[PDB]
Ligand binder design. Structure first.
Ligand SMILES: C=C(C)[C@]12C[C@@H](C)[C@@]34O[C@](Cc5ccccc5)(O[C@@H]1[C@@H]3C=C(COC(=O)Cc1ccc(O)c(OC)c1)C[C@]1(O)C(=O)C(C)=C[C@@H]41)O2
Ligand SMILES: CNC[C@@H](O)[C@H](O)[C@H](O)[C@@H](O)CO
Lengths: 536, 54
């Protein structure tokens, strides 16, 4: 075998299978070759910063990945050295994990990967009727279904979630079961296992809490069982809880607004209460406001600990949680200054109140019409203004320091005022009063004119064109982003729920087959769906 | 016939016609089937907020 750092573990059997030499494989297995050798070189492992071919490190997974069912049947069934269908590589991936890994959502890839997956499952059921390969988790704790959901393999999900086997002795592997079919309409049951309740890591969690790099994060929710589940959960109980939370937040903001508006104007907090109705309602509003701030604070910390987001995607995702957290931080700083005998608590309070209203736009998420505006604002603030800030600051600093250098003891002779006035020129709020008596007036006018042409005309309209691109690019994507917001909202509402009750099952605990490989009968909480199709 | 809320009034003639069984339809009409029966269950009525086959 190879003993280098790059081809570590490559042996003759891997070469034979890769070369599609059935004869040499048969001879090698007949001659006592090891069918469980691990090809664990850097070439053979999952990697980012180097080309490679990760297949699962084993001859069986190599045959499976390369679309050679004959070799798979040989390795599993041959008596000289049968292969272990449940073998796990260094990553913990089985052959099914390897097959899911090498998918890429193309037509031929979908076809042969689906076929090989199906045939491997049938062979496993015949050879090992008590073995459930799909329940095996890799080192990351992912089943093949969870792995496919995580990586955004649309074809593998579209196969697995609605899988139906029309063959006896293996129908217990099916996840879709058909109850009836009429002319255009037909009713079926879907298995639902490890979609809603998994105890480790469900499909809906994996889709919703993905890192936003998944190429088909939105389309995964269009697959029919998930779409029906989210619609059912929405209509059943989540919609009312969402509206109730929105209403309570509105009441909170109204109380905070009223409490802030009637603040006292004397010096040196804290301010003594008087035996009058106004002070009692005022301090009540203060207490409720600080209470809400503390609530949001702890919710934000719980979110960050549960998700553990990285910095690179800290703001790409988790935008709304960050803003709610920042609001609560401003409230707490206001409390600290209030009890520290400083008037400047007012400043902190004011900012929180401002955010307290604008974060109301979070509750537009999940409405098909109004949700788009929050997303447009988020993308524009994160993408376009963030990049354009440096270009504009270069122009601002250059022209400001030029002008400040030119003037000798005028109104412009200070960085503060000059920068403010140039910013006003950028938005069209200038003065242009050339009624002064300083020298080099022509140079000053040329500088101001060049700045105004460069910033008011050229740069600002470039910015506006880019924002127009971003706005019009996601206007038609609303139908999907709505669904994704709906999904994450539902999962959060079910997750917290603050009553310890988790009666979130969908349909009856029904029996499908009744004839396991053993004498048991499997009740799997299947969910009924009726679908319409006008074909032919 | 079915006596539920969804398939009310459906009889063998409707099933045979849906299945495209000319022979069974001819036999059923020959055996005294009612060709004017009303299958007015919720599955077979016009509706917006439910699938069906009107
Ligand atoms: C921490 C961040 C990211 C942030 C906090 C403050 C300072 C913020 O300005 C920014 C930077 C900024 C400032 C001024 C103009 C544009 C951008 O963006 C947000 C942040 C951005 C906004 C504007 O964003 C919104 O439209 C609200 C909003 C949109 C979408 C949402 O999903 C959402 O969920 C809570 C909220 C509101 C402010 O918090 C606000 O009220 C004040 C006073 C400034 C805005 O800094
Ligand atoms: C102070 N300089 C600003 C004005 O020139 C202003 O642009 C115009 O008057 C018009 O927008 C409103 O009067």
């Amino acid at each position: 075998s190879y003993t280098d750092s790059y081809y570590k573990g490559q042996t003759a059997l891997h070469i034979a299978i890769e070369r599609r030499n059935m004869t040499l494989v048969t001879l090698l297995v007949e001659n006592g070759a090891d069918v469980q050798a691990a090809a664990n070189g850097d070439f053979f492992k999952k990697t980012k910063g180097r080309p490679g071919f990760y297949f699962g490190e084993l001859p069986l997974s190599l045959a499976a990945c390369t679309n050679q069912l004959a070799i798979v049947k040989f390795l599993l069934q041959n008596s000289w050295q049968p292969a272990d269908i449940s073998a796990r590589d260094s990553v913990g991936n089985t052959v099914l994990h390897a097959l899911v890994e090498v998918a890429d959502n193309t037509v031929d890839n979908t076809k042969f990967v689906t076929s090989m997956y199906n045939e491997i499952l049938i062979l496993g059921a015949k050879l090992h009727p008590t073995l459930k390969l799909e329940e095996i988790t890799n080192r990351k704790g992912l089943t093949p279904l969870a792995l496919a959901a995580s990586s955004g393999k649309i074809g593998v999900l579209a196969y697995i979630l609605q899988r139906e086997i029309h063959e006896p002795e293996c129908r217990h592997l099916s996840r879709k079961f058909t109850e009836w079919a009429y002319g255009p309409v037909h009713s079926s049951l879907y298995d639902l296992s490890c979609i809603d309740t998994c105890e480790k890591n469900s499909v809906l969690e994996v889709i919703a809490y993905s890192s936003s790099e998944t190429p088909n994060r939105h389309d995964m929710l269009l697959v029919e069982p998930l779409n029906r589940l989210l619609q059912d959960k929405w209509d059943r109980f989540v919609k009312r809880i969402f509206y109730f939370n929105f209403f309570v937040y509105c009441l909170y903001m109204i109380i905070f607004t009223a409490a802030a508006y009637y603040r006292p104007v004397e010096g040196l907090p804290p301010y003594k209460l008087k035996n009058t109705v106004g002070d009692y309602f005022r301090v009540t509003g203060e207490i409720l406001s600080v209470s809400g701030g503390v609530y949001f604070f702890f919710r934000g910390i719980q979110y960050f600990l549960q998700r553990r987001p990285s910095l690179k995607s800290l703001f790409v995702d988790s935008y709304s949680e960050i803003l709610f957290f920042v609001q609560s931080l401003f409230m707490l700083v206001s409390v600290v200054l209030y009890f520290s005998q400083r008037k400047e608590y007012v400043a902190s309070m004011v900012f929180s109140l401002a955010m307290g209203w604008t974060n109301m736009l979070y509750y537009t998420r999940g409405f098909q019409q109004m949700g788009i505006y929050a997303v447009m604002i988020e993308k524009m603030i994160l993408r376009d203004l963030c990049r354009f800030m440096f270009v504009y600051l270069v122009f601002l600093f250059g022209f400001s320091t030029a002008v400040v250098t030119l003037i000798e003891d005028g109104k412009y002779n200070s960085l503060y005022s000059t920068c403010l006035e140039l910013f006003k020129f950028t938005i069209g709020m200038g003065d242009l009063e050339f009624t002064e008596n300083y020298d080099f007036k022509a140079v000053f006018i040329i500088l101001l004119l060049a700045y105004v042409i460069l910033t008011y005309i050229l740069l600002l309209n470039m910015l506006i064109a880019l924002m127009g691109e971003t706005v019009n690019k996601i206007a038609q994507e609303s139908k999907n982003i709505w669904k994704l917001q709906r999904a994450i909202t539902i999962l959060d509402t079910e997750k917290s729920f603050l009553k310890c009750m988790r009666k979130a099952f969908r349909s009856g605990k029904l029996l499908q087959v009744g004839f396991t490989p053993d004498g048991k009968d499997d009740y799997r909480w299947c969910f009924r769906v009726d679908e319409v199709n006008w074909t032919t």
